[PDB]
PDB file of C-alpha atoms in Angstrom:
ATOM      1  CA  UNK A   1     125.081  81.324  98.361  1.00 24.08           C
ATOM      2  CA  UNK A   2     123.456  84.184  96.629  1.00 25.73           C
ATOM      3  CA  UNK A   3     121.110  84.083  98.921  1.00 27.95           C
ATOM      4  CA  UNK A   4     122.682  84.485 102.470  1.00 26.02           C
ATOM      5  CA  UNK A   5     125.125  86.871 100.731  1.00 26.72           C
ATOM      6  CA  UNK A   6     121.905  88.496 100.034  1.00 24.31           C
ATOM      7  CA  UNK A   7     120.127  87.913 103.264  1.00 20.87           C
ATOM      8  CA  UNK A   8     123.311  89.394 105.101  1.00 22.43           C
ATOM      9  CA  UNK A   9     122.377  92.906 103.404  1.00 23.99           C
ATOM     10  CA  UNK A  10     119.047  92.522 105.188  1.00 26.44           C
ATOM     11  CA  UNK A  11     120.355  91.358 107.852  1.00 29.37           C
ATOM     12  CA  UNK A  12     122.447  94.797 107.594  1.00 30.37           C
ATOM     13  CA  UNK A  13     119.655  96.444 106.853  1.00 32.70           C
ATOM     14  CA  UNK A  14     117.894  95.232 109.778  1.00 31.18           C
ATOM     15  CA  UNK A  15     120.679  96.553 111.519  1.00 29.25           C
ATOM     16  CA  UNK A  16     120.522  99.823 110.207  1.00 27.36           C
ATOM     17  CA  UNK A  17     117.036 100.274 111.119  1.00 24.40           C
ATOM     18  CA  UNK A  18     117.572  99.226 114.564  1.00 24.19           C
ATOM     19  CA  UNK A  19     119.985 101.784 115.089  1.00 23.98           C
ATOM     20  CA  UNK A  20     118.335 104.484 114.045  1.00 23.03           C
ATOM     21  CA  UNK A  21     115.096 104.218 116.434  1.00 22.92           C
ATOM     22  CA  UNK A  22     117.644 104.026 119.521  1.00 23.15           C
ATOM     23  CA  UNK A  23     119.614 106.712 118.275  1.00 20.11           C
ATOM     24  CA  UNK A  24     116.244 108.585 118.365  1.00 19.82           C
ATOM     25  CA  UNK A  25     115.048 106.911 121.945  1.00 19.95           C
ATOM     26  CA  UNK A  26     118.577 107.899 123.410  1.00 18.57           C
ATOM     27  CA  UNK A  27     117.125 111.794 122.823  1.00 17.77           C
ATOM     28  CA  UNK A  28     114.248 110.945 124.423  1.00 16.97           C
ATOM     29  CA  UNK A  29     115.810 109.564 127.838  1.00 17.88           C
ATOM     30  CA  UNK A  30     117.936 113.151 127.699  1.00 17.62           C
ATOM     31  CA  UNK A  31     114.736 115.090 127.501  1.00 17.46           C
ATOM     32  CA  UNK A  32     113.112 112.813 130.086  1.00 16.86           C
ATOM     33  CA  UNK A  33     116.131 113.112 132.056  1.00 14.50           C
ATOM     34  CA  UNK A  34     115.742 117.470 132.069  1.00 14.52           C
ATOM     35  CA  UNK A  35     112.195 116.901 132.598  1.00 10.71           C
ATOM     36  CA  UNK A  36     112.501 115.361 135.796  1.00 11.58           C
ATOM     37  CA  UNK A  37     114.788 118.488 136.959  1.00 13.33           C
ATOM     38  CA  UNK A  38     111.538 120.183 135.997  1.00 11.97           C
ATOM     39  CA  UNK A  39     109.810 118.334 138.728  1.00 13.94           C
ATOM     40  CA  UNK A  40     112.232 118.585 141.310  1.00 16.38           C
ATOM     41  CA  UNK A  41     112.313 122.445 141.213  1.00 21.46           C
ATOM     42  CA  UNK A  42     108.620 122.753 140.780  1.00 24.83           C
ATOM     43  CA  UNK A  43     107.887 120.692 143.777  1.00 26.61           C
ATOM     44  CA  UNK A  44     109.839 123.062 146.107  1.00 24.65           C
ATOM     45  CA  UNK A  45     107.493 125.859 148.119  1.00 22.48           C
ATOM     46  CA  UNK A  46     109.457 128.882 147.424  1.00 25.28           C
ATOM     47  CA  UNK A  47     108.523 128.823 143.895  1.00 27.56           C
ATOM     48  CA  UNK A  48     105.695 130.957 143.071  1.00 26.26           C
ATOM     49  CA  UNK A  49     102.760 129.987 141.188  1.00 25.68           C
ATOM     50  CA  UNK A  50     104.304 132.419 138.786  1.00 23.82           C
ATOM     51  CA  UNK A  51     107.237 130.702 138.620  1.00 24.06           C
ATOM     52  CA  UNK A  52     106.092 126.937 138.630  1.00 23.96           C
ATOM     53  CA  UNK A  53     103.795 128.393 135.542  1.00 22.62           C
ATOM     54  CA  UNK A  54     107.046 129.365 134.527  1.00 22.54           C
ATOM     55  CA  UNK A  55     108.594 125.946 134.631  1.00 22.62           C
TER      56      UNK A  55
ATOM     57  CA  UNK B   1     121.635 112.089 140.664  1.00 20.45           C
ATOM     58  CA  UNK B   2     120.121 114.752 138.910  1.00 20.86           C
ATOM     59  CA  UNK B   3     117.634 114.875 141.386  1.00 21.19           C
ATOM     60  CA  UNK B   4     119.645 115.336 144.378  1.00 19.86           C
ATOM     61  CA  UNK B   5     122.320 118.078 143.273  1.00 16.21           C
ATOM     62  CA  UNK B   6     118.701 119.664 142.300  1.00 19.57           C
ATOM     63  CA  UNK B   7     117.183 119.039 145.477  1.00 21.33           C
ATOM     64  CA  UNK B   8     120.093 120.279 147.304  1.00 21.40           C
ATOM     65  CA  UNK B   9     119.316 123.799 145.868  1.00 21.32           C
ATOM     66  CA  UNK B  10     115.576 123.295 147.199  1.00 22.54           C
ATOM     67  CA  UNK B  11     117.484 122.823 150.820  1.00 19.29           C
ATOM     68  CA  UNK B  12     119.268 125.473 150.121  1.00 17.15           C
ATOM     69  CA  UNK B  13     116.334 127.811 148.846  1.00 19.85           C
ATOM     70  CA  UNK B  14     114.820 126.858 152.170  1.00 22.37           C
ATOM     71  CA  UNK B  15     117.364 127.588 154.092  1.00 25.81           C
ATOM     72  CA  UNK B  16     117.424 131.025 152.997  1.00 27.72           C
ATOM     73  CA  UNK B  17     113.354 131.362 153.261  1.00 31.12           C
ATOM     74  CA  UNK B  18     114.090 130.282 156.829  1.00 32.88           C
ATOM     75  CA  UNK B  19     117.260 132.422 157.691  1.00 33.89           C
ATOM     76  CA  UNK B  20     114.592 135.620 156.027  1.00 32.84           C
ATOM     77  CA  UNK B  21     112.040 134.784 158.638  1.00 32.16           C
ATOM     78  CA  UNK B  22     114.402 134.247 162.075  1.00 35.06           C
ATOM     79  CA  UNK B  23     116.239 137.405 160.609  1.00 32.97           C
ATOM     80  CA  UNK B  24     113.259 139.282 160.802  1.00 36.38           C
ATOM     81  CA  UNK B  25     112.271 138.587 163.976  1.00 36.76           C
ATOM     82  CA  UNK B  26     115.811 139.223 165.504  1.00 32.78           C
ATOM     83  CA  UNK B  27     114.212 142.600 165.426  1.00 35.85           C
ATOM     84  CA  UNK B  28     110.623 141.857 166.781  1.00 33.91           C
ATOM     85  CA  UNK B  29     113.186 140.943 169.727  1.00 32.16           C
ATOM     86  CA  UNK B  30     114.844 144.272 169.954  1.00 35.43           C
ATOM     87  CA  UNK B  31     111.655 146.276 169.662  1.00 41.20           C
ATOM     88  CA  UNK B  32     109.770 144.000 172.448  1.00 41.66           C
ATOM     89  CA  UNK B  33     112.791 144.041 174.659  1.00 43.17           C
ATOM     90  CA  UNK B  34     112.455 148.215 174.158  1.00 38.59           C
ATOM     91  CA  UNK B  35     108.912 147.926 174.471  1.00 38.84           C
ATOM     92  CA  UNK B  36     109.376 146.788 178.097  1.00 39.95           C
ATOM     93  CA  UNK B  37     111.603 149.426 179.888  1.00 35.94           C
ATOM     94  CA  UNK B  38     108.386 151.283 178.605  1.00 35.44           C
ATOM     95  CA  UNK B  39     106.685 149.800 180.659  1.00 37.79           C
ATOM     96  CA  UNK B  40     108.778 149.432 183.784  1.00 38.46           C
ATOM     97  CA  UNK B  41     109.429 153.551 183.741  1.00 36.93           C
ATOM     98  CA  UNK B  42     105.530 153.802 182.990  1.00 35.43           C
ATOM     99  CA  UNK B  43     105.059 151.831 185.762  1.00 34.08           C
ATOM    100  CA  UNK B  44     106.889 154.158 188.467  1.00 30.92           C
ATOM    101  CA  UNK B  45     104.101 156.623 190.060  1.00 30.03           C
ATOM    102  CA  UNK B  46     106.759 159.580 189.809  1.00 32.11           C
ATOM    103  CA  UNK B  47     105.222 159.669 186.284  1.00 31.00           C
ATOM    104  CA  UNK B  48     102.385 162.054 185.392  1.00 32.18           C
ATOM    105  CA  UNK B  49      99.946 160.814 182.889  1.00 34.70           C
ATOM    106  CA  UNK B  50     101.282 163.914 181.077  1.00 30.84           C
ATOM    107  CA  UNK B  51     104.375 161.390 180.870  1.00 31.43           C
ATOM    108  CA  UNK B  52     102.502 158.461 181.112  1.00 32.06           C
ATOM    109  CA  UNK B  53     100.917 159.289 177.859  1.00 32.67           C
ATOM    110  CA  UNK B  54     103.615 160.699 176.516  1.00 30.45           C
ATOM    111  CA  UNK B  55     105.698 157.033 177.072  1.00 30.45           C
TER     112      UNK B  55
END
């Protein structure tokens, strides 16, 4: 009993750390997501090479 | 998603590079359409080449 009590903190603990790397990953698919509208624009021909530099 | 709404402002970007160039030579029209009644009044031997040259 003391353990699963026990083994449900790590359990929660587990949990905890889960959490926090796809709370970091879900920044990382909203900078992916601008840095595909950084692609999009770049690819056009009436940028410059100034402006695509620029990008 | 993001991709389209962006490429729809590269269609649109184009579309004003394109309306630029046709705009432009709207007026290569004019000036070759003038440029040839100089050419039929150069072309009438009442002309002297004092006129001729002066066309």
């Amino acid at each position: 009993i003391r353990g699963l009590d026990m083994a449900s903190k790590n359990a929660q603990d587990g949990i905890s750390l889960i959490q926090t790397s796809e709370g970091a990953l879900n920044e990382t698919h909203s900078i992916l997501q601008r840095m595909s509208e950084l692609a999009t624009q770049a690819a056009n021909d009436t940028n410059t090479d100034s402006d695509r530099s620029e990008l």
